[PDB]
Each structure stands twice: as C-alpha cells, then as structure tokens.
Amino acid sequence: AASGSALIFDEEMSRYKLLWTDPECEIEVPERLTVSYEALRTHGLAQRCKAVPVRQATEQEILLAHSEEYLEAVKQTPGMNVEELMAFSKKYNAVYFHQNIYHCAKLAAGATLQLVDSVMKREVRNGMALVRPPGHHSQRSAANGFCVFNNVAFAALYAKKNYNLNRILIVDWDVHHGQGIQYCFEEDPSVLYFSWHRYEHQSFWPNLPESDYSSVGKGKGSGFNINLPWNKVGMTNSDYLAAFFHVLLPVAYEFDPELVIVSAGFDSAIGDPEGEMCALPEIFAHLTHLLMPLAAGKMCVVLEGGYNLTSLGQSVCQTVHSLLGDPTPRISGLGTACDSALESIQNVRNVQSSYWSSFKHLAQSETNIVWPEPLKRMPASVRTVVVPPPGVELTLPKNCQHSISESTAKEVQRIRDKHFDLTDQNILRSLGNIISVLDRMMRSDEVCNGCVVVSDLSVSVQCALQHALTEPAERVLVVYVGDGELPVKTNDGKVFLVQICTKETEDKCVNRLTLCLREGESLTAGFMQALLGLILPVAYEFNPALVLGIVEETTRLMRVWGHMTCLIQGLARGRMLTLLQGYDKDLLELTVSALSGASISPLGPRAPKPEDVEMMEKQRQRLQERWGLLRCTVSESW
Numbered sequence: 001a002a003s004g005s006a007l008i009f010d011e012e013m014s015r016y017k018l019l020w021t022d023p024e025c026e027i028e029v030p031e032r033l034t035v036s037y038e039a040l041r042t043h044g045l046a047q048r049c050k051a052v053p054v055r056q057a058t059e060q061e062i063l064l065a066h067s068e069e070y071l072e073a074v075k076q077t078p079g080m081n082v083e084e085l086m087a088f089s090k091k092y093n094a095v096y097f098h099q100n101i102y103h104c105a106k107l108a109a110g111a112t113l114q115l116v117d118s119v120m121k122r123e124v125r126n127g128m129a130l131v132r133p134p135g136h137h138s139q140r141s142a143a144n145g146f147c148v149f150n151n152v153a154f155a156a157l158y159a160k161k162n163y164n165l166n167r168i169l170i171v172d173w174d175v176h177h178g179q180g181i182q183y184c185f186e187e188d189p190s191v192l193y194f195s196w197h198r199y200e201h202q203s204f205w206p207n208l209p210e211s212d213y214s215s216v217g218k219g220k221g222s223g224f225n226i227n228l229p230w231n232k233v234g235m236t237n238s239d240y241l242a243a244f245f246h247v248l249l250p251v252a253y254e255f256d257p258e259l260v261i262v263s264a265g266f267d268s269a270i271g272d273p274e275g276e277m278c279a280l281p282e283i284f285a286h287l288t289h290l291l292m293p294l295a296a297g298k299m300c301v302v303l304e305g306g307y308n309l310t311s312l313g314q315s316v317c318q319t320v321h322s323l324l325g326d327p328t329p330r331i332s333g334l335g336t337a338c339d340s341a342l343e344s345i346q347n348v349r350n351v352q353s354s355y356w357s358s359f360k361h362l363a364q365s366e367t368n369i370v371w372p373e374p375l376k377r378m379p380a381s382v383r384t385v386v387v388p389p390p391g392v393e394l395t396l397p398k399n400c401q402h403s404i405s406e407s408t409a410k411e412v413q414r415i416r417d418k419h420f421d422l423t424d425q426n427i428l429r430s431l432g433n434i435i436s437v438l439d440r441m442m443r444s445d446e447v448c449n450g451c452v453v454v455s456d457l458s459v460s461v462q463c464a465l466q467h468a469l470t471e472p473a474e475r476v477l478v479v480y481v482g483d484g485e486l487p488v489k490t491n492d493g494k495v496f497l498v499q500i501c502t503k504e505t506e507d508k509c510v511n512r513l514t515l516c517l518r519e520g521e522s523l524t525a526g527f528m529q530a531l532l533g534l535i536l537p538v539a540y541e542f543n544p545a546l547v548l549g550i551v552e553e554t555t556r557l558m559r560v561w562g563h564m565t566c567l568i569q570g571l572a573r574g575r576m577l578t579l580l581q582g583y584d585k586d587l588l589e590l591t592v593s594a595l596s597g598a599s600i601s602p603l604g605p606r607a608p609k610p611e612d613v614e615m616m617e618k619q620r621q622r623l624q625e626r627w628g629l630l631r632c633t634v635s636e637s638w
C-alpha cells in the first residue's frame with residue numbers, strides 16, 4: 001500500500017509578476033509561493049515530503065479543458081512587450097499577463113498532473129502542489145481572476161482519461177466561486193463539485209447568478225454541482241465545520257469518490273483581505289482530515305488563492321501536517337453556525353434533496369488582524385500501542401508497538417483494595433495495561449493512542465475513565481457499541497457518552513446520545529449518516545481531551561468501525577483509547593490500522609431506512625439547543 005506525501009513546487013513559478021499599476025490585481029504576488037514553501041521548510045514539513053519535479057503540461061493536455069483559439073492567443077504572450085501585454089489582459093476580467101506567465105501556467109498545470117500521477121500510481125498516498133497562477137476561475141476560452149489555465153479541471157479530466165476513473169470529488173474551499181470548474185463539469189455526473197464562497201447576495205466577485213445554491217448541475221449532471229454561498233463575511237470555524245458535517249461529507253461519503261482533488265485557497269482563512277472570514281488556520285487541518293478517509297486517502301491538494309502572507313503560511317502547514325498524518329490540533333469555542341450560514345446550509349440541503357439520500361427526508365413532510373500562533377504538531381515516537389491477549393503476536397505496522405512498571409503495579413493494587421472484591425489475576429493485568437497505556441498517551445508526546453483487549457467491561461471502563469479524569473483530562477468523550485449500562489456518570493459536563501445499541505432507550509439529558517439503529521441491510525448507511533450528522537458535530541463542540549472507545553463482545557459493524565476510528569481522531573489531538581471486549585483478530589487488526597493512520601478501505605455506495613432517519617432527527621431536535629453545531633436549519637425566534 002502507498003506511503004508518504006508528495007510536495008510539488010518550483011521557484012520558477014514565482015518568476016512572473018504584475019508590471020503596471022492595477023489595484024484589482026495588486027494582491028497576487030510571487031511572495032505567496034515563496035512564503036508558503038519557506039513556511040514548510042521552516043516547520044520541517046517540506047523535508048518530510050517526497051519532492052516530485054514539476055513539468056510542463058503538453059498541448060494535448062491543455063486542450064482537455066481549453067479551446068485551440070484561446071491556447072493559440074496565450075501562446076503569443078511571451079513575445080509581447082508591456083504595452084501589448086496590458087492590451088491583452090484588459091480583454092479579460094481581473095487577470096494580468098507577463099512575458100513568463102504562459103511558461104508558469106504550463107508549469108502550474110503540469111505540476112498538478114505530476115501530483116495526479118504520483119497519487120494514482122500509488123507512489124504516495126496523497127500530496128500537495130504549491131502552484132502559481134491559480135486555476136479555478138479559468139474557463140474554456142478565457143482567463144479570469146488571476147487564472148490562465150484550469151489546473152484542477154485538468155487534473156480531473158486527465159485522471160478520467162488515463163485512469164478510467166468513474167467518480168471524482170473536487171472540494172473547492174477557496175473563498176471565491178470556482179466557476180471555471182463548474183462550467184467544465186456541469187453536465188458531467190462523474191465529477192462532483194463542491195464550492196463554498198463569499199457571495200453576499202451576488203454582490204461579491206465574480207457576481208454570478210450561477211454561483212448560487214440553486215445551480216445543481218445540468219442534464220445528466222444535476223445534483224453533482226453543490227454551491228454553498230456565504231452571504232455575510234466573518235464566517236467562523238463553526239460555519240465551516242457545519243458546512244462539512246451537514247452538506248459536504250454526507251454527500252461525499254455517498255458519492256464514494258475514487259479520487260479527491262482540493263482547490264485549496266486559503267483566502268478563506270482569518271486575516272485575508274479578499275475573503276474577510278474568521279476561520280483559524282487550524283480549521284484546514286480538520287478540513288483535510290475529514291476528507292482523508294475518502295478514496296483510500298488518495299487526495300491531491302492544489303493551491304489556489306491566499307493573500308495574507310502570514311495566515312497563508314500557517315494554513316499551508318496545517319494542511320500538509322494533516323497530509324503526513326500528524327495529530328490534529330484541538331479546536332475550541334465551537335457552537336452554532338451563524339444565522340446567515342444556517343440559511344445557506346438549509347437552502348442547499350433543500351434544493352439538493354432531490355438528488356442525495358442524506359437529504360431525501362427533507363422532501364416529504366411525512367418525515368422532514370492578529371490571532372494566536374498555532375501550536376506545534378509533532379508526530380508521536382510510537383503512534384499506536386497495542387495490547388492483545390497474552391502470548392498472541394500479530395503483524396503490526398511500522399509505527400505500532402506492544403506494551404508494566406512498578407509505579408503502575410502499585411496503583412492497580414491501590415485501586416483493587418478500595419473499589420473491587422476481585423482477584424481474577426489477568427483482568428488485573430488488563431488494568432495494568434490500561435493505566436500504563438494511558439500514562440504513555442497523556443504524560444508523553446511519544447505515544448499517541450492505543451488499543452487494549454479486555455475481558456471484564458465495567459471494571460476496565462471504570463479505571464480507564466477514572467484514571468483519565470484524575471490525571472487530569474478536562475473532558476472525556478466515550479463512544480460505546482453495545483447494550484447495558486456502564487459505570488459512567490454523565491453528571492457534570494466532563495463526560496459525553498455516545499452509545500450504539502440495539503434495544504431502544506429513552507434519553508433523559510443532553511450529555512448522552514443513544515442511537516438504536518434497525519439491524520439489517522441499511523445498518524451501514526444509517527451509521528454513517530449518524531456519524532457525519534450527529535456524532536461528529538457534538539464531539540467537535542464538546543472538545544474532549546481523550547476519546548474512549550468501547551466495543552462489547554457481539555460483527556454487524558465491522559464495515560464501519562475503521563471510518564469512525566479515523567474520523568474521531570480529529571478530537572483530542574488523536575488521543576483515543578479503545579477497549580475491545582474479547583479477541584477478534586480482524587476487528588483488532590482493523591482498529592490498530594485506523595489508529596496507526598493507515599488508509600481506510602472504501603464502503604462503496606444502500607440508502608438508510610426511514611425509521612432510522614426519524615430516530616436520528618428526533619435526536620437532533622433533542623440536542624441542538626445544547627449543542628448548536630448540530631443545527632442545519634435556522635431556528636425560529638419567539
């Protein structure tokens with residue numbers, strides 16, 4: 001299986017610049033590229049990536065997405081002086097040409113195909129291309145908004161032609177609408193395009209009616225274009241995350257893309273003078289993370305906009321950090337999306353309900369500037385510690401390890417005399433393992449998470465949980481698959497309990513979330529809809545310091561467990577301790593692999609049972625006043 005992350009860059013693409021005064025264009029500078037690469041070298045991240053040489057896109061390749069007439073006209077700009085280059089630029093909207101921009105445009109294009117080839121040939125798992133000029137505004141016969149050729153559109157057309165790909169997801173988190181991408185794929189159901197963007201009721205550039213949420217595609221491609229307009233500036237992490245949990249991820253995991261291309265503009269980051277949003281660079285570590293379980297991790301990130309040289313550097317690093325699998329930063333202060341965002345989110349969901357099954361219940365009323373420096377993100381010495389049953393030896397990935405000092409062994413006796421009596425001398429070894437693994441996770445940056453196999457649940461959960469609280473871990477999120485009650489108090493706001501059961505259980509308070517999904521064929525799609533639209537939004541607002549996973553000895557969800565384990569590592573900087581009751585070679589192989597940061601096997605695209613969606617929306621109704629990040633409609637005033 002593939003390993004590593006590509007980084008495609010070349011100082012040559014910084015060798016074109018604006019040559020006359022023009023305040024429309026004054027912001028697109030060469031320094032964007034060199035600041036971004038220098039931030040990656042300063043943080044050690046460039047050195048950790050496979051450097052892949054840039055190349056030129058050939059003439060045949062440029063014609064995948066552009067007309068001969070336009071290619072011929074651009075081919076002439078290297079022969080042009082400054083008067084002639086100004087005359088040529090004035091024919092297009094918000095774009096300047098330079099003697100060397102045709103050259104760099106072919107480099108920005110070829111660099112993107114270089115990235116597509118490395119990911120699709122399994123030479124890396126994923127990667128990023130720092131390129132200039134950007135692409136996503138470019139159109140079949142026109143330059144637009146600093147873009148000459150449509151790099152991201154090339155990538156999808158090229159991956160279609162040369163790899164026989166059926167499904168390609170393009171995620172455009174630039175703050176501008178990528179209308180060139182939309183035009184190119186509006187009739188193509190094989191490319192799903194998602195774009196959020198500053199719209200301000202069409203008063204923001206490019207001022208297009210088609211940038212609105214009602215453009216869903218055309219013809220055989222309706223439902224594979226999703227526009228999410230931001231109609232106010234100042235959008236926050238909670239707005240961006242709400243867009244992902246309630247619009248983008250439900251749609252993306254059902255589409256099941258074979259490859260993910262990101263138009264990564266960081267003008268949607270705090271401090272940018274074009275986007276004027278308020279999302280912290282760290283959010284891009286999570287935007288990247290939430291997409292990495294798609295398509296076996298095959299993700300190509302292509303740089304677009306980004307104009308505040310400082311936020312630019314930090315958001316680039318948070319993205320590459322997540323591409324290399326480093327632990328994600330904790331996001332604090334999350335809650336409800338703002339009213340304008342909830343209106344936009346609500347309006348997209350309703351128009352898209354004709355096309356996607358996560359939104360289909362909406363259609364019938366039967367069931368309807370300075371900010372703090374981000375912290376350091378070091379990968380653990382050993383990422384994952386595993387404790388299988390005694391004497392069982394397994395094939396472990398290179399970043400895992402097996403696990404009792406005397407310090408820890410006195411503690412187990414201390415606990416035993418007080419609260420248990422019990423003498424089963426190996427469930428006493430399990431609690432030695434639980435404690436020594438927990439001590440390694442929290443006291444150290446050298447171990448990240450861990451999995452322990454246990455036999456007695458309630459004693460194991462008690463010590464795991466109590467040893468985590470009195471450590472201290474501010475909050476613990478507990479995720480439990482099974483039935484019966486455990487020794488967990490949801491009393492204070494220090495524990496939140498997700499439970500996945502089979503018998504229906506009336507919930508009382510807003511610090512427990514109980515999902516009784518009907519067993520059968522639709523169990524897999526229902527679990528994913530709950531994971532994306534209930535569990536992740538609450539977990540993210542709760543902001544736990546530790547995640548405790550617990551599986552009862554019972555099979556039915558061996559298909560979904562790796563996705564959850566991967567996604568849930570967006571909480572608590574990845575510190576998650578999983579207790580498996582009983583030995584299952586394959587469930588344990590699967591848990592360790594997701595915890596180790598390996599690739600997740602895709603699910604493929606069978607729609608969930610309506611009884612299950614009724615159950616999940618009753619849970620949203622019951623929790624969204626305490627947990628605002630669950631909201632995907634505007635609330636009604638008194």
Ligand SMILES: O=C(/C=C/C1CCN(CCc2c[nH]c3ccccc23)CC1)NO
Nearest residue numbers: 023024094145174176205265267304305
């Ligand atoms: O991020 C990007 C970059 C997109 C660009 C889009 C176009 N505006 C130009 C703004 C503008 C239009 N008329 C003006 C008059 C005076 C001053 C300024 C302007 C700049 C950025 N693409 O992804």
Ligand SMILES: [K+]
Nearest residue numbers: 172174176196
């Ligand atoms: K966008």
Ligand SMILES: [K+]
Nearest residue numbers: 185188191224
């Ligand atoms: K499309």
Ligand SMILES: [Zn+2]
Nearest residue numbers: 174176265305
């Ligand atoms: Zn932009």
